[PDB]
Design a protein around this ligand. Sequence first.
Ligand SMILES: CN(Cc1cnc2nc(N)nc(N)c2n1)c1ccc(C(=O)N[C@@H](CCC(=O)O)C(=O)O)cc1
Ligand SMILES: CN(Cc1cnc2nc(N)nc(N)c2n1)c1ccc(C(=O)N[C@@H](CCC(=O)O)C(=O)O)cc1
Ligand SMILES: [Cl-]
Ligand SMILES: [Cl-]
Lengths: 328, 328
Amino acid sequence: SMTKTWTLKKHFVGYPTNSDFELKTSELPPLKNGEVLLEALFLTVDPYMRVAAKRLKEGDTMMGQQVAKVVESKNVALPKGTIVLASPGWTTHSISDGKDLEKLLTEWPDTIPLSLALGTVGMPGLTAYFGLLEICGVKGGETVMVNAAAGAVGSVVGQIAKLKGCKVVGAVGSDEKVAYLQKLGFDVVFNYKTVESLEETLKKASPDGYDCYFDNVGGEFSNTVIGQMKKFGRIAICGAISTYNRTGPLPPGPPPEIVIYQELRMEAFVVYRWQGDARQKALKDLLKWVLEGKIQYKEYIIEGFENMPAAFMGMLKGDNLGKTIVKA
Amino acid sequence: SMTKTWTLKKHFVGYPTNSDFELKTSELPPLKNGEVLLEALFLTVDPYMRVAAKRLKEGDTMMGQQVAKVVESKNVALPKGTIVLASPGWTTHSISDGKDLEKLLTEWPDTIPLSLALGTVGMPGLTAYFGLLEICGVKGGETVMVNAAAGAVGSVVGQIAKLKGCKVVGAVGSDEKVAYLQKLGFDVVFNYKTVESLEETLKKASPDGYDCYFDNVGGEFSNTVIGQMKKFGRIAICGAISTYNRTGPLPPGPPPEIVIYQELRMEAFVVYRWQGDARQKALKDLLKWVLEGKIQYKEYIIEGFENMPAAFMGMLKGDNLGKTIVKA
Ligand SMILES: CN(Cc1cnc2nc(N)nc(N)c2n1)c1ccc(C(=O)N[C@@H](CCC(=O)O)C(=O)O)cc1
Ligand SMILES: CN(Cc1cnc2nc(N)nc(N)c2n1)c1ccc(C(=O)N[C@@H](CCC(=O)O)C(=O)O)cc1
Ligand SMILES: [Cl-]
Ligand SMILES: [Cl-]
């Protein structure tokens, strides 16, 4: 059984380039007992891979999740044709013993793409759900600031915020994303790349300030938002994508006098903190809200495993509208 | 009657200097009904004044709290001789209508100096109390890092943590402060100015990391501590004294990837958040611990109201062992 694999050939400096990756064709051993052979159907690329790749050694497989089908099975719990979520990395075929696999929701309907299991009704959507509902702790009526608002996490954060009864101000990197989020129902959406003054734009978007900040971006942008947080404002620190592809020193930290005077609470989190009953409940909620039309989705599907590095680089640079997914 | 007052002659640039302050003598009017004339007994100087002074206009009185005696009274709740806490700023005498005054605890004993009402058994001690017990939420058996650990706040934090069963690692700016806290029994104390490597020093002090960080200092020092926090570690942001006198940009912030991976919770606070029963209970706990010897105190008492700017500047430089107090 053959497989293709994208490995890290050279550690990224700034943004990745194509020569930092190397495609390798490898032979897989026959299935041992209890194992299954998985064929990737859809693979995801996500911002955290830029950071996690710094702990790889050159020659290692790029990390990542995929929706796959069992093509050969020596495990009766996972017969041939079963669809699963698996994280073997950027590889077309992989062998698993079944412990590290997740079946899709039992009521997953024919009407929603399986690829949403890597997005809105998968790990990005769960990140939004717990970051907003538990870390920010929205009760309804808050003004929420969300950046990278057209990504899979941010778009879910903003739409959950709307259905919980919040005002949502979203920052995105292109005019195409501005129009998209306005159609989704965000109260204010703006292109942070072209606005004359981020501080002025945020003050006009909410003269009263912000109760909650769902922060995917970090850096100088968050320093500006911090200066417009209300007293006891809550910040959920989900990512710092503005720093992942940085070439020099990190930007200044936030102004402590404002942080202290406003008694801000800032908590970072990773989606894996939540498991079991909480996590199954959240996936069911996300699926229900999608079916009810309260959460709309959009995917940027790139065809061909050979284009995974390019999909990752375009995703990191904000070139793609919707969740970037690679179709095998 | 007459009063002397220290005013802000010019906004501070960097550390305050002598030329930034101006002493003025003024005439107070007669007492209207319900008012009292107050004579300062002890005045405090504190780091927050470096920050709050930025909001003053030139010519304004410097802000701050004092222990005062009622020397003349037209208010039956405050007879002559009553000792109160009041915040008229840096002034020897003032008129108040009673609604902005605080009587000392009813049970205040003759064995502890009245000046402690501005320190260990006053706002600095309360800051330590709530910051540690409610913001860090220590339970017993944790490892706590506290900086400015020989200050009025830090020394209470470390000693409360000790009586709750925690390992305490303290950072201070002089060998005299190191020796004093080591005698008090803090598990590890070091002079952050002289260590060969702050990272190595913190590693040896707690190989497994820090559960709680009580932060008075901020800046680059806190970046190093954040890198050694345990998962779900809790930071109480009380002050950032290392930044208050800065003349240029703030240092970089912590590596965002470490904050996220360790899922840290960082919350800033000011003691005034707690009022009523919560504050009274805390003050009585602090008094009880002092009487029982579980909290030792130290004061640096400067004689003469004319020396208040010098006391303020010495305190900001860390030149004094013990809470800095001015005896009128
Ligand atoms: C699976 N997962 C949780 C998560 C978070 N941090 C990690 N960090 C590491 N080191 N390793 C992990 N496996 C990991 N996993 C995810 C996956 C995607 C996104 C995410 O932010 N995706 C983008 C994708 C954007 C796009 O496709 O354009 C988004 O904004 O939705 C977050 C968490
Ligand atoms: C009264 N109080 C609460 C507090 C805190 N921040 C404020 N900030 C502002 N702007 N305004 C206030 N009134 C204010 N009050 C205090 C007072 C002192 C310390 C403090 O940290 N004192 C020094 C004293 C050290 C010394 O005297 O040598 C220390 O670090 O221990 C903290 C809070
Ligand atoms: Cl963007
Ligand atoms: Cl110090």
